[PDB]
Design a protein around this ligand. Structure first.
Ligand SMILES: [Zn+2]
Ligand SMILES: [Zn+2]
Ligand SMILES: [Zn+2]
Ligand SMILES: [Zn+2]
Ligand SMILES: [Zn+2]
Ligand SMILES: [Zn+2]
Ligand SMILES: [Zn+2]
Ligand SMILES: [Zn+2]
Lengths: 278, 278, 278, 278, 278, 278, 278
């Protein structure tokens, strides 16, 4: 084509609508009963989805309330750019294909956005992954003390129940829920806060003050299937357990998310790194 | 008449004013002491008022804070249209004259708005029914151990005590109050929250996580005269009892409401389906 | 069934989701290219859709930004209930089946909500009609000198472009658009304001001060195909033409809407009352 | 009675409701066609109503959007208390029975609230005066280039058309409207701003900068029947005419309002000070 | 003077400023140590101030956060006008000179504003009373478990500590504080809520549901010196004690306030009705 | 004193109140008619007040709407600290006693806050200077063709005319007004916007795009008595004249202010640097 | 230079940017591990930083969330100017060079702004002091049982986690943190509220009611290293200890701050007035 004399092939508006609709319809029908739902597309949730979907047989829905995925991983600290990842999580960066400046006990990715865009590109390309962005998980499906999926709505509806006539949610059944809701914002820690309000867990003390050396090891260690059918990963772990926060460093999110992914595979009865069967 | 050359008969502005004033103020005088007040015109409250007002002896005031009645029954889930009603509540739809597409354990009304408009149209035509919309129930009338009506105001006043000099409420005495306030919004669960703040009940746990099979049977079961003079119906039942929620399905709202209406007839000493005397 | 011992047939959450999704997305595909789109489900828009859809050949989509349809027709004036309809528009009420208390030059419907629910119930039951509520028309489709449909989005999105990353709209092609957006609210007069901002008309003076005798005859008279492909009806007519307003009387809305429907049938080449071929 | 052992006579809640309702109903029926409506109960509007209602045969409705009447006359300047009134308007204070500290060219009432409460008490006691507080004039009634009354609503509705489904206004016919809307607030200058938007006057330049000596004489001089059926008085005069403001002094408001009252009597064909017939 | 040819005597702007300033200064100096401060100028606070200041030797400061005094006594219920006062409180109306329509167990003042304006006019005329409107009591002065006055600020500052750099309060010492803060609004029940937060009282259950017959007698009975140096009166009594509310009736406010006034006189060691020494 | 065993001398709350009241109200009386009022205590206004008040004959009131004085001079750009001052304005820094790091065509003050605090400390110590902070100039006093002072109120009142009953302003007469209101914020360019709305100047184009080399020389040049009685200085000059802006450099503000001060001395008939008589 | 013909030396925009960037980022690197961080630049925090930085060996970072430093020390009470300082804290004023009007048990600084500007000017000139304004301390660094610095962000970010994708904080390590966050505003008492939410202290009762004689001595007394690594000073002490407040008097803030500074020097192992080694 010539950028100086450019013509698009013709279109009809109604075709564009119908293509989008049909495709979103079929996705919602498929994923109404899914193997894994990941709630939250921050560094931890992306890392978990990336790890799980390496198994091509596993269906992965990602529910993200924001229009943009990525969570807090578009920046470092104080609106600066550099992303510090402590060793040995730089091996995870190697696998995804993200360059870094190597230091002695850590590496520096030149922009957090480079990690986030790269992992998302590789993740979203896979046929077994679907991103439902601009959609919130408002609640859980819980039957006989097992989490069995999530209660969904458009994110803007979920934040506007006070300004309109009622707007019921939808429902997505899942074998395993990976809750990766962070701590930040009006949606922070949605999943663990709901476990508490329905009496399935007893306390959500909230994250403690900052201590990077304690926090990152603790967050990985504490990542687990918290109740039957629900794994918690990322900063949401610190909320439920009262672990210290780590601030502007990203290794624990990546590793927590990877561990959560392997826990989800285990929960599905599939080869996994938790068992040593992978 | 001719749509091409159309003339309305003459009017005067004063006539319009006086018509609306004389009629509304007459209705307020009529209903200031009444048989039943239904608080909330959602699916459960409309169903309750519909059921009660089948008896002509019985005067029924419906108090609805929104300008529009209907509550959460203008939509299905995720801003979609279809209204799922589990059997055998399709027999209630048959009685009201709402068509549906039948499936094995449920039916589908093509638009929630078709239910709501249809039942409202039949209900409002009745001479013993009065809709006071744009009016909130701010509080209860309680004398000794018994609910004896509601404390009312324009909904916008009830929402703007923070912005103007004080604006006292009005009062409506009733033999029975049917509280159908839902759980959603700033007015969610007004009646049961008030029973708790005045010490007449102990807790309002809030609805639990979603489980349609448990929730709908539970809401019907738990629909009751909670304290002397006050029946609670619809999702407000889940709030008081800590029942699971059901999300985008509507049978329990209709049946809970119908049961609440029958309980109100029984409380008034009238033939009813609770006793088997209807 | 027994209200004392009540059991719903079994369900699964996934069934409810898939039912609502399959049906809504099927409707969107059906109506993405359609015969008539009515924007606004107030008294004028409901009247127009009611009139058009008397012809079964004609597919009619109603776009309503609010969750609740009905517009300003849930109340009379000053939050009072009575709906004044000047003669001879009481003949339209007769046709729809809405009772009234007759006076000399007008009739009184006991509650505006009785009109609105009744006409909606009859309208929505029809197979050729689809209500897309909680959906705003953000813009028009205009090709050359002609309106060819509407640009749509969830209403909450259309109201929240200031708070999230961009969220493109959808598109619905139509042979005729009937714009019935009122004057009230942030969406008041959307269609005529847009004709002005794209240069297809010159001014939108806004409604003038109140004069019922002038206003209602004027609104009917001025109801028209304003530009090729687009009819304007109801109070949106006053905005474009600088007509006086009428306040709490509703005959002109019903008759303007009826005339707009007949004008749409005429524009589609069908038997109609404008020509005298119905 | 004994303040140490006090018992009220018994009451029924429904009686209180019915008394308020019946009385407000009859007032609204009476005043739906009134001789004078005064819009705004600030110092100018109170002064105008006080002057007019000295004729016991003249019906006076006062429409005030705030719950509290009094407008800007509860304080002096900068939240201080003293009310400066230039001579010879202290003669007006003498008539109403408001004490002052007399200085050479002006007097000082010790609290603006003393003037406001005193004039209101004397005004409201009269049988031909009715105060409709918490009610806004949203618009005018205009028929054939004469103002014929006002379009009313509850004030909170008039400020909330953007948050609810539409809420039509009511209407009050009047022989003469006295617009006394001030300049301050979101309702400031309602009446003259509407004259401009409907093309009945051509410009509303807004008040000029402060100059007490020019402003107070000018405001009195310019008080007039601005268009047929509508007198403007008080600070709203400065808005329409572009007169200077006067800030924390009150004589012109009192005298403007008195003049407006005498102009209203003249407009009604009654003895008055404008003609020298009183 | 001639309303047709009117001239004010000359003024200088700076004189107006200086008069207001000097006068407000001297008032604030005088009242920085006062005999009684009444917090809240609603029906109860006005009634208390009116009762106390019948003793010309007693200094009374009234602190009212709103620009307009009067509290909730500008209206009846539901924005209607009539003020119901149960017998025998109509004797209080007789004393103040407020007309009413006499019924069997109650009387009806035609507009609540007639009571409020009349009592305020008589109250404010007295030399020993000062109204500090647009000023909030933010806190109490408490020394050795006795209330010794109030912590004040301009009301707008008291509501804007979140939008500006810090703005310290002022202080007013008092022999007795009469707290009459109502229950309504963001300032509702200021005085009793502060007693609770500083541990001087133990519970503030809040007002119970409506029951006029119980409430009005209870409110009068419970009006008292709650802690040394502080009397509570009006609806604030119901907040501290958990008494029922009474809604749109005004006798208890008047009588509570009168009793509070006589309690204040007693606390000052002066002749009073509590002792039978008056 | 001993920080380990520290006792303050005794106080009484009333003393503190009376001290603050007597002093402030005395200052208001002093300055109600004054020589110069400076509106705005940003870098330009502080510089102007500093320059003028070098003459002891001259009384200078500074009106600043914010609680904190200093305007935009607490920071450099992008929330960084360093304050760039182009030569030869470093000579003004020398005079005030502000250190800097010298470069070739400019100097760097280490923190903008060091300039602002330093100049304020020297300015405020002077007996002829009074800072009225938390006070806005809402309007001008204009008599005939000449500015003669300012219309003042508490800043929060000036921002809350939409939320309360009216609150009149106060007035300060001045021989000269120096308007230094900046361009930023809701109060940006108050003085020049007012000249335009009262018709004394024709346009306020607003500042143009950034060009430091053009802008700083232009702002100094254009600093002038714009209309009789009123000098405009600082970025408010760019707004009136359509000059380019300079962004994060401060020399023009200091020099414009100094020139404005010299112009004020000249206007007062005093020795000045404009004429060469200083 | 000539104010009549004024030319600035040339500049380039890039130079200004690079100057501000290089300097700020150099300061951030310097202070990322530092001796003392003072959180809050109100009267107590400025006094503490002033006291500490008398020792040149000691690096002191001041973190202030507002753009303007100074806290509540720009005004006295009720937006009045005079700053009351009880003796013997006037000796601290003597040392800083702030003039006052002496009384018997206290002195009066003519404007609070004179104190604040003066102390800031002396403080900020010192080479060992850095003001990071527009920067909030969001959290603490806590390792084991000890506070080791602060978690920082731009203040606007710290206030806008609800409106944007996540924005991680930054970190500053410190040997000692002096928390001087006041009680006022959304950031009031940040440090002590955090000690409570992480479980390091048990309660934050909040300040009690006003009692100047008790409060000021108590605040000095209670100023302490509350937990290892963290001193609390100023009104934040009242919040943690439930001390009474003092309102518009400032001696305790200055003395508490001075004591806090001496406690910080002692904690650093340096000569100090707590020990008597200074
Ligand atoms: Zn109330
Ligand atoms: Zn819901
Ligand atoms: Zn777009
Ligand atoms: Zn309207
Ligand atoms: Zn004003
Ligand atoms: Zn700027
Ligand atoms: Zn975070
Ligand atoms: Zn404070």
């Amino acid at each position: 084509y010539d950028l100086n004399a450019f013509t698009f092939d013709p279109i009809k508006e109604s075709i564009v609508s119908r293509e989008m609709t049909r495709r979103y319809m079929t996705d919602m029908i498929t994923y109404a009963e899914t193997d894994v739902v990941v709630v939250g597309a921050g560094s931890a949730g992306l890392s978990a989805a990336y790890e799980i979907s390496k198994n091509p047989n596993v269906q992965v829905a990602i529910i993200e309330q924001s229009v943009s995925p990525g969570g807090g991983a578009w920046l470092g600290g104080q609106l600066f750019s550099a992303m510090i990842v402590r060793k040995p999580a730089h091996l995870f960066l190697d696998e995804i294909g993200v360059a870094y400046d190597e230091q002695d006990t850590y590496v520096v990715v030149k922009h957090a956005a480079l990690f986030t865009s790269t992992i998302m590109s590789k993740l979203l390309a896979r046929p077994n992954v679907k991103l439902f962005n601009a959609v919130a998980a408002e609640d859980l499906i819980v039957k006989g003390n097992r989490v069995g999926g999530v209660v969904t709505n458009w994110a803007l509806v979920a934040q506007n129940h006070h300004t309109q006539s009622c707007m019921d949610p939808n429902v997505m059944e899942a074998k395993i829920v990976v809750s990766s809701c962070g701590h930040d914002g009006p949606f922070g820690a949605t999943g663990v806060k709901r476990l508490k309000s329905i009496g399935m867990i007893d306390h959500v003390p909230g994250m403690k003050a900052l201590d990077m050396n304690t926090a990152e090891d603790a967050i990985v260690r504490l990542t687990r299937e918290v109740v039957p059918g629900m794994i918690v990963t990322g900063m949401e772990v610190a909320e439920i357990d009262g672990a210290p926060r780590m601030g502007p460093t990203f290794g624990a999110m990546m590793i927590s998310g990877q561990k959560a992914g392997q826990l989800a595979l285990k929960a599905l009865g599939l080869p996994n790194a938790i068992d040593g069967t992978l």
